[PDB]
Amino acid sequence: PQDRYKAVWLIFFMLGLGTLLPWNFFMTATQYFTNRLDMSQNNSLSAIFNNVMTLCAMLPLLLFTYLNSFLHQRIPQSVRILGSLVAILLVFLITAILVKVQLDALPFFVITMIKIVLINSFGAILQGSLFGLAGLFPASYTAAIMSGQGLAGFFASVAMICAIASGSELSESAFGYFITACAVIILTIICYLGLPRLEFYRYYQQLKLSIKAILKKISVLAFSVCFIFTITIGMFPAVTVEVKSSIAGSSTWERYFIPVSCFLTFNIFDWLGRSLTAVFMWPGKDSRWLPSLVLARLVFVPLLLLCNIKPRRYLTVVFEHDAWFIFFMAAFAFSNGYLASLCMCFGPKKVKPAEAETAGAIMAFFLCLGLALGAVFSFLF
Numbered sequence: 239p240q241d242r243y244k245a246v247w248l249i250f251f252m253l254g255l256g257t258l259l260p261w262n263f264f265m266t267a268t269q270y271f272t273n274r275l276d277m278s279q280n281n282s283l284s285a286i287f288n289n290v291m292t293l294c295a296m297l298p299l300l301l302f303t304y305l306n307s308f309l310h311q312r313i314p315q316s317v318r319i320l321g322s323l324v325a326i327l328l329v330f331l332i333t334a335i336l337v338k339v340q341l342d343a344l345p346f347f348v349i350t351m352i353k354i355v356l357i358n359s360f361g362a363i364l365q366g367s368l369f370g371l372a373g374l375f376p377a378s379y380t381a382a383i384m385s386g387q388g389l390a391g392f393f394a395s396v397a398m399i400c401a402i403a404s405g406s407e408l409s410e411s412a413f414g415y416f417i418t419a420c421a422v423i424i425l426t427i428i429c430y431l432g433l434p435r436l437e438f439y440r441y442y443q444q445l446k447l448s449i450k451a452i453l454k455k456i457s458v459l460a461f462s463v464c465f466i467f468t469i470t471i472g473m474f475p476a477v478t479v480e481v482k483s484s485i486a487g488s489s490t491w492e493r494y495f496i497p498v499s500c501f502l503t504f505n506i507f508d509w510l511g512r513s514l515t516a517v518f519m520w521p522g523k524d525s526r527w528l529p530s531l532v533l534a535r536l537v538f539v540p541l542l543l544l545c546n547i548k549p550r551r552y553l554t555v556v557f558e559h560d561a562w563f564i565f566f567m568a569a570f571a572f573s574n575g576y577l578a579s580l581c582m583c584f585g586p587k588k589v590k591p592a593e594a595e596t597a598g599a600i601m602a603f604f605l606c607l608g609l610a611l612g613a614v615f616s617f618l619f
């Protein structure tokens with residue numbers, strides 16, 4: 239088992255980047271979708287876009303990670319991975335074209351929501367199939383996917399900041415997002431196609447030659463990863479983007495405080511947390527400390543809620559200084575990426591090799607169940 243040059247590891251890293259960089263770029267272009275709806279409409283469509291997008295994203299994402307966990311064995315992995323990648327590529331290509339064509343508000347809203355359902359439907363299959371595949375490899379190769387996903391969040395943050403500072407129209411920034419995603423998806427496909435000729439890949443993928451029982455074996459890590467993202471999506475981004483600076487010296491802060499202090503902070507430390515797990519995985523697959531630290535994250539709900547949210551009707555600002563918010567976001571984000579990566583890395587290793595693929599697929603569903611439960615909870619918070 240010699241991953242010569244770490245080619246397979248790097249390919250798995252690129253696969254993670256590819257799974258989320260398009261969707262992350264889509265999310266960072268929300269301002270383009272809402273502003274486009276406002277300049278078209280003559281209870282509005284922009285006022286409901288975020289909530290309808292959320293519903294059109296989590297419900298498909300959850301349904302198809304669930305189905306994949308039950309049916310991944312009936313479809314070849316290359317069909318599930320390459321087929322999903324090609325579908326997402328086509329949808330983002332269309333998303334890019336719609337930037338340049340005139341279309342009334344309601345058709346644009348509807349067509350966009352349809353594409354959002356396809357992105358998360360094929361995204362579910364893609365992600366469920368990647369973690370299942372990675373379940374056959376050492377734990378470090380699931381961390382490669384998680385790490386690559388974190389970089390996708392980092393690039394998304396850099397793009398958001400650069401778009402604001404560019405001064406360009408939201409539409410031409412969004413068009414750049416979507417074209418970049420298309421190119422990244424194409425690169426991701428090329429990298430995947432290079433795996434079969436690598437001996438390290440064939441060595442663990444060779445091992446292909448009772449869902450209820452598998453679920454019991456990974457239940458601790460499956461439920462932990464679910465609780466990780468219940469908290470995370472519960473608080474981020476819907477709640478945290480409402481925080482305002484209390485030390486800003488210039489009106490130039492206003493448009494940069496959130497993309498910098500919130501989004502950039504989160505994606506930097508989330509990415510670094512995921513990346514650390516490729517080399518350092520304390521407390522280990524059997525330690526009860528891992529679920530315990532996942533539980534401890536509950537503390538971030540009061541902490542962040544009592545930061546400088548303005549306007550606010552009912553609570554007080556206990557932590558008004560920006561430093562509190564940035565610090566909470568860093569620990570909030572680092573604990574997410576690190577513990578989440580540990581859960582995904584360890585889940586498949588609580589089971590025999592012939593079941594590690596299904597274990598990874600189930601872990602993907604519970605990760606997405608956490609995303610969905612967080613969206614529900616955050617829609618009260």
Ligand SMILES: COc1cc(C(=O)OCCCN2CCCN(CCCOC(=O)c3cc(OC)c(OC)c(OC)c3)CC2)cc(OC)c1OC
Binds near residue numbers: 288292361
């Ligand atoms: C497709 O699979 C995933 C989806 C999400 C995901 O979509 O999370 C959010 C869930 C609920 N959201 C619904 C969709 C829209 N969104 C609001 C979009 C506006 O947000 C952003 O601009 C944004 C920018 C970022 O970077 C600049 C982010 O970090 C990457 C980000 O994360 C949610 C959102 C609300 C929350 C997260 C994942 O791993 C972390 C996935 O991999 C399993």
Ligand SMILES: CCCCCCCC/C=C\CCCCCCCC(=O)OC[C@H](O)CO
Binds near residue numbers: 243244389
């Ligand atoms: C903002 C920073 C961006 C972060 C960027 C990601 C960091 C990459 C991590 C580890 C490199 C390990 C990869 C080792 C290089 C392998 C290249 C390879 O594929 O080797 C075979 C090649 O095709 C024939 O020479």
Ligand SMILES: CCCCCCCC/C=C\CCCCCCCC(=O)OC[C@H](O)CO
Binds near residue numbers: 517
């Ligand atoms: C804006 C400045 C932020 C950018 C800073 C770039 C830092 C590089 C990435 C993560 C650092 C955290 C520790 C990195 C350890 C990663 C382990 C690794 O990549 O090696 C995996 C290899 O394949 C073994 O199997």
